[PDB]
Amino acid sequence: GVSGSKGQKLFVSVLQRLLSERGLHVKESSAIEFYQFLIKVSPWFPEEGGLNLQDWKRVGREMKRYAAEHGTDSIPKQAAPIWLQLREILT
């Protein structure tokens, strides 16, 4: 399998359950944009990471480095909001 969208539908489905139980809703295309950004910046996360603060704080650091190095317009507008909400959910 060499699909470009591996894990995408699972990620979207999980993201959408976690966010919807806090009253927030992301468009599918936007959820997919975020996922592609996450696996670009932090490909180790699905493989070795968990839904805990240490790992999610690391994903944050790595996304921030990416912004600093590439400018805040190669980044999806929804990346910081979604990251932030997941951080809080993990708290």
Ligand X SMILES: *C(=O)CCCCCCCCCCCCC
Q: Which residue ranges make up the site for a copy of itself (CB under 8 A)?
A: 21-27, 30, 34, 76-78, 80-82, 84-85, 88
How far apart CA 72 and CA 87 sit, in angstroms, is 20
Q: How many CB atoms lie within 10 A of CB 53?
A: 12
Binds ligand X by CB under 6 A, chosen from 2, 4, 54, 71: 2
Residue 88 binds ligand X (CB under 6 A): no
Residue 14 binds ligand X (CB under 6 A): yes
CB 34 within 8 A of CB 79: yes
Residues of this chain that interact with ligand X (CB under 6 A) are 1-2, 7, 14, 46-47
